[PDB]
């Protein structure tokens, strides 16, 4: 498929809100944020403990005026409710001693460092699975030859940074509201 398509078979509504839940049931489910170092708040991207809770829901925009998001499209990622210290929803990759790291910001960033993402497909499946992508951007606009997989704290987080190569595959679900806050 060239589109992207969610788990209901239905393709991924530009800008709409979705769960990243993993393929394989046994991995946690659910992207949210952490607290880690000295953020002075949660700022750091992890990966909800418990297998059934669908962690956070996340606007899923790309940089085209399309009402489907198309594989090929670098994309921005983001809790669409973003934790105070933010005032930017959006994921973001900063550089730790143990290299990339998604995060969040105090600050906006520039959309080309927003805009540094790339779904990928996987074939030996049933469901539409997904391979995140993330693309540096040096000489040249675009490259996407690294790879977002699970890394583990001392805390038992489930830190998302950019890993040599073991994936999180991915399978995206419609968000059923967007009211889930703290309002």
């Not at 699970?150 to 830190?159: M, P, Q, S, V």
């Given at each position: 498929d060239d589109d992207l398509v969610d788990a209901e078979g239905n393709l991924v509504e530009n800008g709409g809100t979705y769960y990243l839940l993993p393929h394989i049931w046994a991995?946690?489910?659910g992207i949210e944020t952490a607290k880690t170092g000295n953020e002075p708040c949660p700022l750091?991207?992890?990966?909800?403990?418990?297998?059934?809770?669908?962690?956070?829901?996340?606007?899923?925009?790309?940089?085209?005026?399309?009402?489907?998001?198309?594989?090929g499209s670098l994309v921005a990622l983001g809790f669409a409710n973003p934790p105070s210290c933010a005032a930017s929803?959006?994921?973001?990759?900063?550089?730790?001693?143990?290299?990339?790291?998604?995060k969040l910001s105090?600050?906006?960033?520039p959309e080309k460092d927003i805009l540094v993402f790339?779904?990928?497909?996987?074939?030996?499946?049933?469901?539409?699975?997904?391979?995140?992508?993330?693309?540096?951007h040096d000489?040249?606009?675009?490259?996407?030859?690294?790879?977002?997989?699970?890394?583990?704290?001392?805390?038992?987080?489930?830190?998302?940074?950019?890993?040599?190569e073991n994936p999180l595959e991915l399978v995206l679900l419609k968000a059923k509201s967007e009211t889930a806050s703290s309002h």
């Open positions: 991995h946690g489910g750091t991207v992890v990966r909800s403990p418990n297998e059934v809770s669908k962690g956070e829901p996340i606007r899923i925009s790309s940089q085209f005026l399309s009402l489907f998001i198309p594989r929803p959006w994921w973001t990759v900063v550089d730790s001693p143990q290299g990339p790291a998604v105090q600050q906006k960033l790339k779904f990928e497909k996987v074939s030996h499946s049933n469901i539409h699975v997904y391979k995140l992508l993330y693309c540096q000489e040249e606009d675009v490259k996407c030859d690294q790879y977002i997989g699970i890394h583990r704290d001392r805390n038992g987080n489930r830190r998302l940074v950019v890993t040599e």
